Amino acid sequence: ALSLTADQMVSALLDAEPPILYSEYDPTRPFSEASMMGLLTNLADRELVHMINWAKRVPGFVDLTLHDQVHLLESAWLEILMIGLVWRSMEHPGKLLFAPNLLLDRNQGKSVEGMVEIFDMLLATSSRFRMMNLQGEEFVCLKSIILLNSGVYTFEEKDHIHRVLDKITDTLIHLMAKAGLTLQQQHQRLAQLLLILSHIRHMSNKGMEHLYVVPSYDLLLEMLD
Amino acid sequence: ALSLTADQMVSALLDAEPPILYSEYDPTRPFSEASMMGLLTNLADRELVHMINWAKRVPGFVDLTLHDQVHLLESAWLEILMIGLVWRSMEHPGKLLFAPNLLLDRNQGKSVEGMVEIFDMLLATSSRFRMMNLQGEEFVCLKSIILLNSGVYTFSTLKSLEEKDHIHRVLDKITDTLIHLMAKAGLTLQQQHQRLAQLLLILSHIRHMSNKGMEHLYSMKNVVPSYDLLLEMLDAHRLH
Numbered sequence A: 001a002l003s004l005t006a007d008q009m010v011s012a013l014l015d016a017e018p019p020i021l022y023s024e025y026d027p028t029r030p031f032s033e034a035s036m037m038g039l040l041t042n043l044a045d046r047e048l049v050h051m052i053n054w055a056k057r058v059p060g061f062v063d064l065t066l067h068d069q070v071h072l073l074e075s076a077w078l079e080i081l082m083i084g085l086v087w088r089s090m091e092h093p094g095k096l097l098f099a100p101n102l103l104l105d106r107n108q109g110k111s112v113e114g115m116v117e118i119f120d121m122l123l124a125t126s127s128r129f130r131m132m133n134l135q136g137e138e139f140v141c142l143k144s145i146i147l148l149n150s151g152v153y154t155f156e157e158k159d160h161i162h163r164v165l166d167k168i169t170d171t172l173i174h175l176m177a178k179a180g181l182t183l184q185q186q187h188q189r190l191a192q193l194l195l196i197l198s199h200i201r202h203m204s205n206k207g208m209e210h211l212y213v214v215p216s217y218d219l220l221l222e223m224l225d
Numbered sequence B: 001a002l003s004l005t006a007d008q009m010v011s012a013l014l015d016a017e018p019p020i021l022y023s024e025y026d027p028t029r030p031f032s033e034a035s036m037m038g039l040l041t042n043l044a045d046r047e048l049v050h051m052i053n054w055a056k057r058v059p060g061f062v063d064l065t066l067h068d069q070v071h072l073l074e075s076a077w078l079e080i081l082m083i084g085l086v087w088r089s090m091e092h093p094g095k096l097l098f099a100p101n102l103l104l105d106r107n108q109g110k111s112v113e114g115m116v117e118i119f120d121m122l123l124a125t126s127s128r129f130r131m132m133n134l135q136g137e138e139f140v141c142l143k144s145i146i147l148l149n150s151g152v153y154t155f156s157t158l159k160s161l162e163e164k165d166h167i168h169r170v171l172d173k174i175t176d177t178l179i180h181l182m183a184k185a186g187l188t189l190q191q192q193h194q195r196l197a198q199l200l201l202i203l204s205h206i207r208h209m210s211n212k213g214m215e216h217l218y219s220m221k222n223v224v225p226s227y228d229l230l231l232e233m234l235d236a237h238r239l240h
């Protein structure tokens, strides 16, 4: 699984991308903020399926035991939803593209107490992506790093995960070298991208407090087939 | 500030290292679970004062506005406490070295509700440092990154923008320094960016523990250093 090349790594990651899901909002009925969280919960529940099937296609993931595959997914699912949302909303300044038929701004995000604080953190990350000019090849790499690194500190099983993590790091550097960046530009950009992952984790924790709901071990396992 | 060589970065960060503090000594008062949180709170408060002095000596930190210096320490003070604890406990498997005379295991962490969950995460990070053989020069770099990165996405004036641009230049200088250290230690170029990535990914877990811990301090609640308190220690005058 780790004999793939950097170019083959990106190729596998790109073709494994989940689809962009729509809201079940009846587009001819009056939209309402009281029903806003209903749409966002159903949407996220349906994105989790496609996320599971994306994870099995992350090179090296299915080499772990099913028990470990679940644990990483329990620990990373919210972070992956957020980085996906931030990615979709990247070309929509000041708004979050939850779905093509759910574009919200922070001024629709004050409907519930404790929401706009999370909203602004998501908007800030999207602005950071926009300044970074984050490439889709980098994005699928950052997303795979989240999947593998989120639950590794909460457990040969660990050593393999670290070999895949090192391999993704090789691929990120390969992209930056193929783009013409110098070596310092390469290790500076790699650093900047990984420091963003700290904010996404923080967003996840603060996100989870607001929601407190969590996908059970059995549900993630059923989805894993 | 930005002129410094990596070598000059490292000595500055090493010279700024706060001292290792102690809990109170008393041979007639045997350790009990009862006074633990009182000991730990007193130790945190005393460390916080020394943390301020270290922060002011992190190159480029006082170039920021005083208002943004506080927000960064508001955002990072707990992270810096834990990573300092993890560093002290690195050489002591299965224990957390809050002080040389306050070394605890997780059976003592079981005393307080919800504590052993964070206690076990701190030991896992200590073990992660152990199995990477984290060096002291890398340590002080990671601590400086936490100080500047943790609070930076949560500030948006024209001045706010040049603060953040300045922070990114310092963080860029630290990344250079980490690479220079790892190159100086004799790693190949692949192992350098692989180790840099391993180092920085730990910062994601340290953020995770800090949010976990912040939640736990509030479960039993004046828990956090306030803005005016942080400003007070930061906003020194020139009369000394």
Ligand SMILES: O=C(c1ccccc1)N1[C@H](c2ccc(OC[C@@H]3CCN(CCCF)C3)cc2)c2ccc(O)cc2CC12CC2
Pocket: A040, A041, A042, A043, A044, A045, A047, A081, A082, A084, A085, A098, A114, A115, A116, A118, A119, A122, A207, A210, A211, A213, A214, A215
């Ligand atoms: O609304 C919000 C939000 C809130 C405050 C500020 C900004 C955004 N969210 C959305 C959201 C809602 C409920 C939810 O709940 C957890 C699942 C629902 C039960 N699932 C378990 C089933 C158990 F019965 C898991 C998850 C995700 C959602 C949806 C899609 C997206 O791409 C991204 C997001 C982002 C965000 C994660 C922060």
Ligand SMILES: O=C(c1ccccc1)N1[C@H](c2ccc(OC[C@@H]3CCN(CCCF)C3)cc2)c2ccc(O)cc2CC12CC2
Pocket: B040, B041, B042, B043, B044, B045, B047, B081, B082, B084, B085, B098, B109, B114, B115, B116, B118, B119, B122, B213, B216, B217, B222, B223, B224, B225, B226, B229
């Ligand atoms: O016990 C714990 C702990 C808990 C659960 C699991 C494992 C460990 N901690 C210790 C701790 C306790 C209370 C505290 O409380 C907040 C300040 C005390 C009042 N301060 C505000 C008062 C001013 F208004 C701020 C801070 C720090 C402490 C001490 C020293 C250290 O180096 C590190 C730590 C780490 C840790 C932070 C997690």
